[PDB]
Structure formats: structure tokens, C-alpha cells
Amino acid sequence: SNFGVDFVIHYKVPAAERDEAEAGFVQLIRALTTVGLATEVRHGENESLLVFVKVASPDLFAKQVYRARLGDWLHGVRVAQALQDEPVVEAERLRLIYLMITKPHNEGGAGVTPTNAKWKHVESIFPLHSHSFNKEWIKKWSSKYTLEQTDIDNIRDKFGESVAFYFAFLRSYFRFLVIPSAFGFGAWLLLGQFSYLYALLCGLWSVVFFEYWKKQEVDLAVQWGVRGVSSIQQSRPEFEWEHEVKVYPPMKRVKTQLLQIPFALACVVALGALIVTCNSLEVFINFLPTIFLVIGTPTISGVLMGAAEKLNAMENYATVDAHDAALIQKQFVLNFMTSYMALFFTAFVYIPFGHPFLNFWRATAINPARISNQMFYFTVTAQIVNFATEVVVPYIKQQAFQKHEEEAEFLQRVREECTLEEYDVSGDYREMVMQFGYVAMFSVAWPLAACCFLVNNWVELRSDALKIAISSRRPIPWRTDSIGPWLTALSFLSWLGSITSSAIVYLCSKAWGLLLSILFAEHFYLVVQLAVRFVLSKLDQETIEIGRRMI
Amino acid sequence: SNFGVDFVIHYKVPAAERDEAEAGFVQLIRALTTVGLATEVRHGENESLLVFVKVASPDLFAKQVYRARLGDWLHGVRVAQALQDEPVVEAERLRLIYLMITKPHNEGGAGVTPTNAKWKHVESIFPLHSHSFNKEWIKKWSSKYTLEQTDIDNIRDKFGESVAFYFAFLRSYFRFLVIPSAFGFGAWLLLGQFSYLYALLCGLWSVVFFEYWKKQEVDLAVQWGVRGVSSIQQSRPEFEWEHEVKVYPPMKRVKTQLLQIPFALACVVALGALIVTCNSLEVFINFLPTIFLVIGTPTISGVLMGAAEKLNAMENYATVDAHDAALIQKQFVLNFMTSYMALFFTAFVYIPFGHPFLNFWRATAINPARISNQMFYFTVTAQIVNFATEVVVPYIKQQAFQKHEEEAEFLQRVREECTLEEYDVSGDYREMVMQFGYVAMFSVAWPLAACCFLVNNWVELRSDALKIAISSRRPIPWRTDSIGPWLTALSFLSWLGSITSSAIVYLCSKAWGLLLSILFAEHFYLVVQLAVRFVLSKLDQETIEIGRRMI
Ligand SMILES: [Ca+2]
Ligand SMILES: [Ca+2]
């Protein structure tokens, strides 16, 4: 197993800055020595000096643990000799050590942030995996049909909170996806296609699932003693300041943030042109559109994400949560557009009325079922893509790239692990949110399709684990209360689905009827939401003589 | 001034139960003597024995005050020697004395509840007014154009919390009513009648007023140290029990509460028949309808309120707040029906299409302006009624009914005051809520009418005070956090107004256009509410050598 190493620092050494590299190495060693953490130095591949750091003095660690617990007590998160009663878990120990490493000098730490400070040579600080535990976990989850709370608790203990919430949310989603599968099978087998009742049941299911997930999330947050952690604020190391606490004028912030609308219009035009020309080519040729979209989506998605990340970096945010919220909002907008605008133009444009490009295409040289059949590919193809780029090809690429002195195996393992990319949990949230959006606003067109989604989830709950198991390094533990801003996205998708399902039902099978159907669907959704929200709250002497003398 | 009397008990003595009356008198005297409160007995009119009770031992009162403060501290409401730092106010002293008088034996008091227990002879426990302070207050409020926070604070100190919230809410309503007056004057002078823009501004004003009132209510509640008082529960003395804490099966509760729908249908039919026959008589005769409605409204309102109160009494509620909420809900439903159904049938029935009663009326022997002109009377007449039954005629009736031994004036004052009816604050809330509903959902028909409402408020803020000043006895002080369930009624009225204003505008000046207008108005209202809610939230060694040896 591991040699007890608790953290590893890369500290690549450029050739042109040898004196600067030595000075930084000396400064880092001194800073790590003052805080009382034992360190060791070994060899490293590609002009790197891997250094291993672990805690040495138990008294200092216990004092830090007590101080952190008292600080949690002050802020209301939590309501020596107490360590035995409440044992230290690996996640909180790693979090405290990392915070001690990152915290600046003013707060008792030694700030070694790799970007803002003069420490321009360090690039990564990551822990080490437990191969035996990883193998045991993979074997255990591969022989169980359902997952109990013990497995989620073990994941929380060994990895933190964000991973635990992600897995709990995915498990709850898979558990409640069975009902839409049953209703879709029933509707497709008996009712047929474009059933209003199926749309109403889909809306009700979305509402009840969202409310129950909120309740279960609150329950889980209060169970683990983490509820209320989002109340406090964490200072972003990269947050610039211009005057004395650090202050930044809102004028620059709003001026930077108003730049988004140009980019939004530009991406709208860029995606719409491609969508309309693909549709024109398809209606002229009546395999090319599916292949073209499959090839084109990742190339444009990568550049869009890079541009969004750069734009968010240009903006200045005080706390980390605000920056993450902005990034998630931009990511959700871009992904929703690029994953739903094609279906929107195929449904609400092609069907109601069907030339300015058709004539040009002809000079170069209205089947209602188009919504259904295409959707088939638009699920299945996508599914296989989600099982092609995500899992097999990263491992193949890693293997191709891969293809004293008494512990060479450990050094080789560490060197291989260092080059691995850091895991981000936001992508899986995005994928699950888009799955829920598909189910909410488009399952009416193909009631059976929802069933297939269920199967995919039963793989994802394991497959993502494999992604953490091998194809990624151990993420830094963190504390969180909620999944994040994804609740707003889920609510918006549910409302949009309630609007869109009725319109799809009416159009696939004049104007005043459509308006009445939309109004009825929206009001029914609102009433059901109100009723479910109301119901779920209840689940949990002289005086005597004078009185006589009155007569 | 007063002789220091802190509470008065009536204790009427029926002739047929003289022995029982004497036994009850003795028991009450003993119970009041055990708790340590000094008592005195004097004469009383109409076979009554008025008894005056006041606190005697300062140590017991201070201990009770400290115990109550500690109990508040335990429940989170509040965050000897401390009494000097925080002086006792008259309201809290009266509340503590009344609680000591009412609390049963198990909790250290002497329960003298006049209804449930064997104490079947007592009927009232009321304090005494301060005539000099009342005159000074009336004179002060009659010479000021606007009211500062000091007057509201003084009212809170001298009367409690419910009166303070009522006056603050009425003042805020009067302050924000000026903007709709200005917009209505502008629309009537220039735009004309049935303006869509005026309806949109009315909706926006309603939304912003509701949100700002919620924020100001939270601020006021946290300012006076009362916020969170609604969290605790108060046991209702009349709550029956069937098994052992007291428990009551929900089966009886739901069986009793399902009886309401019969009554709702019965009152719907009863009011609708009268409304339709009055409308038929009016359209046949084209002064009788206005006079008939004015005479008929109080007679049917009284019996409806009596029936609702009896029905609520039949139901069993655990806590007092739930019973009050049910009573307010029934009162609001009945009053809204009886005050809006006439206008609803005049607007949404008479105009769109105009016999089954007309032919019968003929055998017995569509002007769009009807909405406007009638509304004139439907305001002004109502206003004069609100200034006829409320103020002048109660005083006239009281004067007509009205028309040792060294303090006969005090005894006469007490005897006159005892017969006065206890003040209820819910009626003024109901009236203000109905005024706001009129402004929200019908000001578009007559933009100028809102202006008149403003004037009425400038009288009510004083007139209601006069009602407390003379025509009523001092209410028992109480502690409350919010105005009550009236917030839900206000929100519902605002939403209904947003729906109704657009429909009125479209109808007074085909179907698909009406549906589109309704949809646009509702969505604009929702978007404005979301934006305002979002905005208002932001208002607030070896290691060195190895490194060198690497080269
Ligand atoms: Ca997948
Ligand atoms: Ca994934």
C-alpha cells in the first residue's frame, strides 16, 4: 500500500530559470518546515522534483483540528479528549492538511498558491489513491443490483462531500426514473403516440421528483453535519483588489459582464446557421446529417467552453461560489442551446409550415413522423457517444502514451498518476441535467425512449466510478451543502417541459386551441406544484365577609 | 387617573344559583390569594360583583418576569438586576399578569377560564383605559399630516403588537397608495378609459408594494425583539381530548371540515339568486338596486358570519393560531364572494352576451358604460356606509342606552366600560384587504377612483383610533410576529387582479386575442415578481543538499 504519504507536490524545474528554481525550492522547503510538516524529496520525470509532505507532530494536528471544530461551532455549522469520541475521518484530515498548505502567512499557514504568488514553478498538489481499496470498491459495486446508504457513506468518508452528493443525486434519479419508464411503456403499447395524459403524468412526475429530492437533500445535509456550510464565505486567492478588507468597484464587474450578450448572439448565429443548412440539406436529399452533427458537436463544444472559461477568467469575482455559479450558468446555457435548438427547429418550424435555402440548393446542382424517427438516433447515437469518448478511448490513449531504488514501483505509480488530469464533477451534473431535460420536455414524442435512459443510468452509476477509479487522479476533498445552482436549472427545465409538451401534442395532431392547451397545462403544473409543496411540509377574612354582606 | 387597578373581573351572579355563586366567589378568591395578587371587592350593576386585582409583592413579579425572559431565551425569541437596564413596559406587564391569571394550576397559575372549567359565572377580564393619555393621543394625531415611527412605537408600548402591526400596515398602505392615484389621474386626464398600460402599472405597483411590505414587516419584527414568536405553540384551553400530551384523532377533524363544501354551495346559490334577480330587475327597469343591496348586505353578512363562527366552533383545533387561520379563511371567502360576485356578473356576463328571467318579469306585469357608472356608486355609497355604521351610530346607540362612596365617578366609569364590546382587529384587516383587492383588480375600469381611496385612508388611520378611544374597551395585549394569514390573501388578490385587468381591458373594447392578452399579462406579472424578489434581496540541512546535489 501507500508509504503514509499525505500530499505530493510536482514543482517542475525549467532549465532557463535554474537559479530562480533553486530559490523557489529553498523558499518552499523553509515554508513547509516552519509549519511543522515533515517532507521528503525524490526523483521526478521530465525535469520535475516530486516532494512528499506528511504531518509529523500529533499535538499540532490535534490543535488544528480543535481550532477548526471551534470555528465551525462559531458559525453555526456544528452544534485532545474529544477526538476519541468523534474519530477523525480521512476526508477531513486531508482537507485540513490541504487548507494548512494553501492558507497564507497572515492566517498561520504558508500560502503556496501556484498562480497568483511568486511560486510560478509549482503546478499541482494531489493526494495518492488506495489501489486495494479501489479494487475492492469496484468489485463490490459490480455485484449488487441496488446500492444501500452504507456505500454512499463510505464514498463520502473516502472522498468528501461533492462526490457523495453527486452519487446520491444520481441514485435518486435512477430510482425515480422507473415510473416514467412504466408509463411510457403503457402509453406506447396501448394509447399510441402523442398522448396528452402521458404529458400530464410526466409533468407531475417531474414536480414530485424535484420536491422529494430537495427534501432528501436537506435531510442528508443535516445528517452528515454539513448543513449551513454555504452560509460562510471563502476568499478567492485570485481575486484582485484596488483599495483597502479588499474592495473592487462594481463598475468594472458590470462592464465585463455586459460583454456576454455579444457572445450569446454570436454563438446563436453560428449554431443556427449550421442547424438550418443541415436541415436544408436533409430536406433536399429526401446518414449524412447524423454523422455531420456527431463530428461537429465536440469540436465546437470545446472552443465554446474555452471561450466561456476565458471570459469568466476576465471577470473578477470575490468568493469562489459566485465564480462557480457564473461558470455553471454559462455552461448550461451553451449546452442547452447546442443540445436542444435542433429539436426546437425540427418541431416548431418544420411541422407548422414548410425555400429561401431550398431554391439555392436546387440551383447549386412534411412528414409528422420526422420528430419520432430522428429522436431514435438522437438518443441511441448520443448514448453510444457517451460510451465512446467518456470511457474506452481515454484509457486507450493513456495506455498508448505510457507505452534507495528499492521502491521503484511506487515511484513509477506516482509518476504515472501525476500526469493524469484533475477530475471535475460539474460535467456529470451537466449530463444528468440534460437527461432530465430530455425526459421532461420530449418524452411525449417517444414514450418508450425513457425506458432506455433507465438502462444507461444503471451503467453510469458504475461507469463514472471507473472514471474516478483509473482514468483520473484523486480529487481534492471539499465541503458543500447543496449540489449548487443546478436546482434552478432543473426547475426551469421542468417549467419549459410543462409548456412544451402540450404544444407538441397539439401541433403533432387552430391558434386559440393551442393557446388554451398551453394555458391549461401551465396552470395544472402550477397547481400540482403548490399542492405537492403544501403536502410535503407535513411529512416531518375581610373579603369573605364583604361578599357575604352583599346579600 | 386610575387607582392603580391592573385587572377587573365581572363575575355576574344569577339569582337561581346563589349558593353556587357564593361557592364560585369563594373559590376564585382563594385561587387569587394563593398566587399572591391583592384583590378588592366593590359594588356592581345588574347583579354583578366587580373585583379589582393588582400585583402586590414586587419580588414575585420580578421572578415571574425573569422566568418569562429565560423561557423566551430558550426558544430563540430573545438573544432582579437586569430590570433596570431593560425597563418593564406596560404591555408586557399586563400580558404577564393576564397569563398568570389564566394559566392553570399545573403550570403555577390558577386557571379561571370562563367557559371550559366549572367557573361558569365569570364572563370578562379587561383592563382600564387611561382617559388623559387617550385624549392626548387623539389630540396629537389630529394635528399632524404624517405619522413618524415614534407614534407607532408608543402605540406598541401602550397596547401590544397586533395593534402596532395593524397601524404600521395601514400607514404603509396609505403611503404607497399615492402612486396609483397619480397614475390613475394621468390616465383619466389624457389616455381615457380602459388603458392597458394603466393595468400593467397597477400590477407592478401591487407586486412592489407586497414585496416591500414583507421586507419592512421582517425589519419591524426583528427591531422590537418579537421575531420568531410564532415558532412556539400555545395550547388552546377549549381543545378537547380523548386519550393520553392530549391527542385528538384526525378522523373527526376531517369529517367536520368536509362539511364546509355544502355550506359553500348553499351560500353560492343564495347570493347568486339575489344577484341575478337584482340584475334582471335593473335591466327590466331601464335607485332601487343600490338601496336594495345596501339594506340586504348587513343582514345576510351577520347571519353568514354567525354560521361560519358556529361551524368553526364545532371543529376542534389544537393551537389558537390554526383556529384563527381557519376563521380568517372562511371570513375572507365569504366577504370576497359577497363583495365581488356582483361586479363579476356585471362584467363577464352582461357585456359578452345578453332572457330566461326577462321573459318571466315581462309576463309578471348592453351599454359598456354600465361597468363605470355603477362602480361610482359601488365606491361612494360603500364609503358612506363605512362612515355610517362604523362610527356615528355606535356612539349614538351607546349614548341612548346610557341615557366609601367618595369615588362614585370611578365606579360609574368602570360600570359603563364593562358593558362595551371587546375590540377585534381582524375586521380592519378584512376591510383594508378588500380595498387593496378593489385597487388591484378593478382600478382599470375607473382610474380616478383610486384617488378617492387615498382620502378615505387619511380618515381611517384616525377614525379607527377613535373607535379604540371611546366606542370600545381596552384589548388584551398579545404577542405576534406577522399580520397573520392575510399575506396569502393579498398574494391571491394580486394574481387575480393581474388576470382580470387584461380581460376587462380586452372585453370592454376574438377569443384567441383574449387568450393571448391573458397569457401575456400573467407572464409579465410573474417576470416582474421574480425580478423584484431578486433585487430586494441585495438591499440588506539534508534536504537542501539533496536539492543542490540534483544538479
Ligand atoms: Ca453515459
Ligand atoms: Ca459521465
Ligand SMILES: [Ca+2]
Ligand atoms: Ca372607513
Ligand SMILES: [Ca+2]
Ligand atoms: Ca374600520
